[PDB]
């Protein structure tokens, strides 16, 4: 009450919760990026110089 508003309690608890969620989300994004199809070039039809069709 001296230097903080009433909602500071909720703000601090939500900040901790959001920080944990953000760490988990960052880990998830890193893993997904490193396991993505764009990274590993999967299901991407690479264009060929002579356009051969199997």
């Amino acid at each position: 009450a001296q230097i903080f508003p009433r909602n500071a309690n909720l703000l601090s608890r939500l900040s901790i919760f959001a920080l944990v969620l953000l760490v988990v989300e960052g880990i998830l994004i890193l893993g997904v990026y490193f396991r993505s199809n764009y990274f590993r070039q999967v299901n991407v039809a690479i264009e060929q110089p002579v356009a051969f069709s199997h």
Partner: protein
């Protein structure tokens, strides 16, 4: 990137020729110009029995 779904092939393909020829290669039969067919693996056995000239 979703796995592509290529358009299917047209009506005419090689399967008809191969299937017809594979059916013809056995089950005996009568060719138009000649007399009689011989199943594949039977003519090959005949070829080894009579043999071929060497040297």
């Amino acid at each position: 990137p979703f796995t592509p779904q290529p358009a299917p092939v047209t009506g005419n393909t090689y399967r008809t020729y191969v299937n017809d020829a594979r059916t013809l290669l056995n089950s005996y039969g009568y060719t138009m110009e000649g007399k009689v067919h011989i199943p594949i693996d039977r003519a090959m056995d005949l070829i080894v029995e009579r043999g071929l000239p060497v040297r």
